[PDB]
Amino acid sequence: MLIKKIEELKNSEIKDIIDKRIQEFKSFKNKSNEEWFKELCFCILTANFTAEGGIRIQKEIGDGFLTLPREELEEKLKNLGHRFYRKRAEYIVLARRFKNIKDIVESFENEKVAREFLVRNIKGIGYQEASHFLRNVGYDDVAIIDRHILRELYENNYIDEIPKTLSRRKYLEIENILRDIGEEVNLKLSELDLYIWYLRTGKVLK
Amino acid sequence: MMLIKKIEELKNSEIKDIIDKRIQEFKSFKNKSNEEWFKELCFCILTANFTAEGGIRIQKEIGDGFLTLPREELEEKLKNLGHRFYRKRAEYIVLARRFKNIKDIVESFENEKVAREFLVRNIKGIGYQEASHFLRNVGYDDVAIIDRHILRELYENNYIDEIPKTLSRRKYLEIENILRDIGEEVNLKLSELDLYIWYLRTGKVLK
Amino acid sequence: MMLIKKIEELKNSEIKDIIDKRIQEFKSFKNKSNEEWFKELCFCILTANFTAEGGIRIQKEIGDGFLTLPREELEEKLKNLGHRFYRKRAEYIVLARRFKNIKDIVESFENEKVAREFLVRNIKGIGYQEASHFLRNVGYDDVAIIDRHILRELYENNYIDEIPKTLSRRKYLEIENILRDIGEEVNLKLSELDLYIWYLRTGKVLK
Amino acid sequence: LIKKIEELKNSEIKDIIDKRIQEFKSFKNKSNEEWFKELCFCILTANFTAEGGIRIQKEIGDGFLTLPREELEEKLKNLGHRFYRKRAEYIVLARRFKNIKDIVESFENEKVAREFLVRNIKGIGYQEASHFLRNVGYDDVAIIDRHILRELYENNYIDEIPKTLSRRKYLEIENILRDIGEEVNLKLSELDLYIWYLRTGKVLK
DNA sequence: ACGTCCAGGTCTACC
DNA sequence: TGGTAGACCTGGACG
DNA sequence: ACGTCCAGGTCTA
DNA sequence: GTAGACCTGGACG
DNA sequence: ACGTCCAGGTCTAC
DNA sequence: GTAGACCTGGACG
DNA sequence: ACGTCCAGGTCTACC
DNA sequence: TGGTAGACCTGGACG
Ligand code: NA
Ligand code: NA
Ligand code: NA
Ligand code: NA
């Protein structure tokens, strides 16, 4: 079933948007360290939150993610109506240790290894949001596994149950099921995601 | 307790001034830039199984080059500067550049002991000996440099029963502890301390 | 990994029988009076910073003396029978006599972990270790005895990064849980598990 | 170190060593057959145990002299000696000097006699030759084995545990000890028992 | 030798 | 609070 | 007189 | 945990 | 447990 | 001057 | 209405 | 350990 649904989206004029988006990421090969970092923050802000809200907050704050004091930045987040302003603001500041994120990430063996580094070395980033970062900046063979695509995987029965938790072991299992699915629909991991996400919500945000 | 006898022997000499101004030299790194810090990390990598002064010279000649120099070029520089392991050390140095702002990364940690834990497992080229070396050099007080010299100095006074071929983190941590006890006894920080014991051996107070 | 290996080969050795005859020696406390249990509780108080062997004869020579002998005479016996702390341990034993029906008090508690909590804050001389040691010695399994020894090899086998100064309740229940997983990876209750781990370093199977 | 030895000359141990040193002197009146059994004992102590060789020397007894090659190798084999084959061979070959007492005594001193033994018997080098001579009553040869050597380096008398204790080694060390000797006022033989006991807490031979 | 090392921790008293 | 330095205290093993 | 031993360890398989 | 690999010039007798 | 540690060196070749 | 060989059997954790 | 639902998780403390 | 509970924390649409 899921296969069928995606097949027709690849046909529908939705495929036209997903690739203005997929390439919207690829262009990060020509973006600055601040931009890349601003994307990392977007991921940190997105966890257990809303994409729309995340987009606003990002555009509204801009390079404030990289110049605002912990107390001043914290307040702005309070303004734009973010669920968790205290915590997420703490992560932003703390993350500045790696403000040259583009150079740090582009220097790893691959993407699977780079993801490993962000998780354990950035408070606020698990596998969900690291995969999200990598993707949003050009990376194809990583999967983002949040509530939604979980739901489409439990629903279409690819997974037994919606895990009370997501160990690294499980994330890499599922991410693979996702990978094998994408060979049939013939999409890289970065693309597929947007497709399943769109089904679920009805928006090719990011 | 002969070592100790020789330690206080030094504390009451014109050597204490040299060491005391040497320690102050490191403590000034609190104001230096990320560059002056990365360039110090490299010096350590250079000094691994090499000459202390041999690494002091190369650091002078290359200077801000540790940041810019490409692989094949920096290799030429080193190869010409007479370093033993030009290829390998050149390799490591370049990789370390992914942390070209090594100050933001180090000061972000809660304590030096944990900061070392990071450096040791994210920078190929750095183990405990040369991270302790690194940190100490940029102004931290509570870490020990457990090289060959201070090792068979300990050993030579029965602080240990053998010179182990390789140092386990548990092994290095245990040895360090041992040094700190001397530290308390003689009243000095593992930073100060290390310059002393090092001097009892070689006769020079470099770094 | 090595520790895991040492264990199972013991489970196949002559030792897998001495420990077993020993484990059911504890379970047989379900059919003993308060006094016999108290005698055990007393044995554990004697063991704090002392020998397991020593506390076994002292309890055998003194027998049911922990219940009748006045302080002065008890301390005297504990002095003659050569106990490290003949005064303090003599005091604890007397104060505990306000629970000389210890069996009725312990079995009353829903379980074991909750009963252990009662022994610790309500009896001088009994900390978390010599509390778990008592319950285990009277037939309880899901509690670990974390003494100088089982600490030595947990640290030697890289399970913990240090031998802590003193064991806090959180640190105890934490390490106790580290042992609890070690248990299921070889299939042994903490009680039985303890004896294997203890025989490794001491080379004996007492209690 | 010297402080420790003084503590020993104080203890009951000093009496234990006096009666032991006098057990060696008795060889002045023992037979060629006896002097040889000690020689064999010393051949069974090289890279082996002092206590092990003792019981072996006691069980085998005069067997070192009358048992055929293969027979002697069996008793050594059974008595759990590390090297039954070789030691039996060394013992058998040495039987050509069965009247070892006559030969040793005929020499000028101990220093020259030991030289003959070493060169003229397979299985015997300096330590064993010294060991031998000490055991029969001779007083100024040092036995340099793993322990008296251990003690000497741990105490900064020598600087390396030489891989190969050369004759030129054995004798520089032997001289050092002889100087450690005047410090405490002991014969090389008495001193060896003192140093050995420190290492081993046993005082046999 | 004589001193060092070491045994299935728990307690008070301090800040 | 809750983490920690000192007190309790002795006999045997071992170089 | 040319050969040996020494220098602030770390990484891979 | 460990040996081989990385690599060189330099002072000593 | 079983694998390493350990014990009063001497010989034979290259 | 120096590896390999001779060769094992108890203790120990 | 206004009490429910829901949104691209991850960290700490605890065992 | 590595899993689990519980915190972080709110707005906006539903009906
Ligand atoms: Na993280
Ligand atoms: Na490293
Ligand atoms: Na208590
Ligand atoms: Na010979």
PDB file of all heavy atoms in Angstrom, chain C residues 103-111:
ATOM      1  N   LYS C 103      14.070 -11.881  63.396  1.00  0.00           N
ATOM      2  CA  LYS C 103      13.371 -12.668  62.388  1.00  0.00           C
ATOM      3  C   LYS C 103      11.953 -12.150  62.177  1.00  0.00           C
ATOM      4  O   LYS C 103      11.499 -12.002  61.042  1.00  0.00           O
ATOM      5  CB  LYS C 103      13.343 -14.149  62.774  1.00  0.00           C
ATOM      6  CG  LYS C 103      12.587 -15.026  61.785  1.00  0.00           C
ATOM      7  CD  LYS C 103      12.712 -16.507  62.117  1.00  0.00           C
ATOM      8  CE  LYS C 103      12.021 -17.356  61.057  1.00  0.00           C
ATOM      9  NZ  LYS C 103      12.231 -18.818  61.246  1.00  0.00           N
ATOM     10  N   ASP C 104      11.257 -11.875  63.275  1.00  0.00           N
ATOM     11  CA  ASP C 104       9.885 -11.382  63.210  1.00  0.00           C
ATOM     12  C   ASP C 104       9.823 -10.031  62.507  1.00  0.00           C
ATOM     13  O   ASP C 104       8.857  -9.729  61.804  1.00  0.00           O
ATOM     14  CB  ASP C 104       9.292 -11.267  64.616  1.00  0.00           C
ATOM     15  CG  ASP C 104       9.278 -12.592  65.354  1.00  0.00           C
ATOM     16  OD1 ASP C 104       9.656 -13.617  64.748  1.00  0.00           O
ATOM     17  OD2 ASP C 104       8.891 -12.608  66.542  1.00  0.00           O
ATOM     18  N   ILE C 105      10.860  -9.224  62.701  1.00  0.00           N
ATOM     19  CA  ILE C 105      10.908  -7.882  62.134  1.00  0.00           C
ATOM     20  C   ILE C 105      11.232  -7.894  60.644  1.00  0.00           C
ATOM     21  O   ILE C 105      10.655  -7.131  59.873  1.00  0.00           O
ATOM     22  CB  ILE C 105      11.938  -6.999  62.864  1.00  0.00           C
ATOM     23  CG1 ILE C 105      11.628  -6.945  64.361  1.00  0.00           C
ATOM     24  CG2 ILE C 105      11.961  -5.598  62.269  1.00  0.00           C
ATOM     25  CD1 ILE C 105      12.552  -6.037  65.140  1.00  0.00           C
ATOM     26  N   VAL C 106      12.158  -8.758  60.242  1.00  0.00           N
ATOM     27  CA  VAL C 106      12.589  -8.812  58.848  1.00  0.00           C
ATOM     28  C   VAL C 106      11.556  -9.475  57.939  1.00  0.00           C
ATOM     29  O   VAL C 106      11.210  -8.937  56.886  1.00  0.00           O
ATOM     30  CB  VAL C 106      13.944  -9.532  58.697  1.00  0.00           C
ATOM     31  CG1 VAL C 106      14.225  -9.831  57.232  1.00  0.00           C
ATOM     32  CG2 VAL C 106      15.059  -8.692  59.301  1.00  0.00           C
ATOM     33  N   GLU C 107      11.063 -10.640  58.347  1.00  0.00           N
ATOM     34  CA  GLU C 107      10.089 -11.373  57.546  1.00  0.00           C
ATOM     35  C   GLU C 107       8.785 -10.599  57.392  1.00  0.00           C
ATOM     36  O   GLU C 107       8.009 -10.856  56.472  1.00  0.00           O
ATOM     37  CB  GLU C 107       9.816 -12.752  58.155  1.00  0.00           C
ATOM     38  CG  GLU C 107      11.032 -13.666  58.187  1.00  0.00           C
ATOM     39  CD  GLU C 107      10.682 -15.095  58.550  1.00  0.00           C
ATOM     40  OE1 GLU C 107       9.521 -15.347  58.936  1.00  0.00           O
ATOM     41  OE2 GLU C 107      11.568 -15.968  58.447  1.00  0.00           O
ATOM     42  N   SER C 108       8.550  -9.649  58.293  1.00  0.00           N
ATOM     43  CA  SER C 108       7.325  -8.858  58.271  1.00  0.00           C
ATOM     44  C   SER C 108       7.298  -7.912  57.075  1.00  0.00           C
ATOM     45  O   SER C 108       6.245  -7.672  56.484  1.00  0.00           O
ATOM     46  CB  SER C 108       7.172  -8.064  59.569  1.00  0.00           C
ATOM     47  OG  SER C 108       8.072  -6.969  59.605  1.00  0.00           O
ATOM     48  N   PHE C 109       8.462  -7.372  56.730  1.00  0.00           N
ATOM     49  CA  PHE C 109       8.579  -6.479  55.586  1.00  0.00           C
ATOM     50  C   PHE C 109       8.200  -7.187  54.293  1.00  0.00           C
ATOM     51  O   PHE C 109       8.571  -8.340  54.073  1.00  0.00           O
ATOM     52  CB  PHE C 109       9.997  -5.917  55.485  1.00  0.00           C
ATOM     53  CG  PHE C 109      10.326  -4.916  56.551  1.00  0.00           C
ATOM     54  CD1 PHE C 109      11.003  -5.299  57.695  1.00  0.00           C
ATOM     55  CD2 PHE C 109       9.952  -3.590  56.410  1.00  0.00           C
ATOM     56  CE1 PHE C 109      11.304  -4.377  58.681  1.00  0.00           C
ATOM     57  CE2 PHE C 109      10.249  -2.665  57.391  1.00  0.00           C
ATOM     58  CZ  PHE C 109      10.926  -3.060  58.528  1.00  0.00           C
ATOM     59  N   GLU C 110       7.459  -6.484  53.442  1.00  0.00           N
ATOM     60  CA  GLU C 110       6.977  -7.046  52.186  1.00  0.00           C
ATOM     61  C   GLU C 110       8.066  -7.793  51.417  1.00  0.00           C
ATOM     62  O   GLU C 110       7.844  -8.908  50.945  1.00  0.00           O
ATOM     63  CB  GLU C 110       6.355  -5.954  51.310  1.00  0.00           C
ATOM     64  CG  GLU C 110       7.099  -4.626  51.324  1.00  0.00           C
ATOM     65  CD  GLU C 110       6.711  -3.746  52.500  1.00  0.00           C
ATOM     66  OE1 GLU C 110       5.938  -4.209  53.365  1.00  0.00           O
ATOM     67  OE2 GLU C 110       7.176  -2.588  52.555  1.00  0.00           O
ATOM     68  N   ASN C 111       9.242  -7.184  51.301  1.00  0.00           N
ATOM     69  CA  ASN C 111      10.346  -7.807  50.577  1.00  0.00           C
ATOM     70  C   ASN C 111      11.680  -7.730  51.314  1.00  0.00           C
ATOM     71  O   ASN C 111      11.726  -7.754  52.544  1.00  0.00           O
ATOM     72  CB  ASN C 111      10.481  -7.208  49.175  1.00  0.00           C
ATOM     73  CG  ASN C 111      10.797  -5.725  49.201  1.00  0.00           C
ATOM     74  OD1 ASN C 111      11.354  -5.213  50.170  1.00  0.00           O
ATOM     75  ND2 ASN C 111      10.444  -5.025  48.129  1.00  0.00           N
TER      76      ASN C 111
END
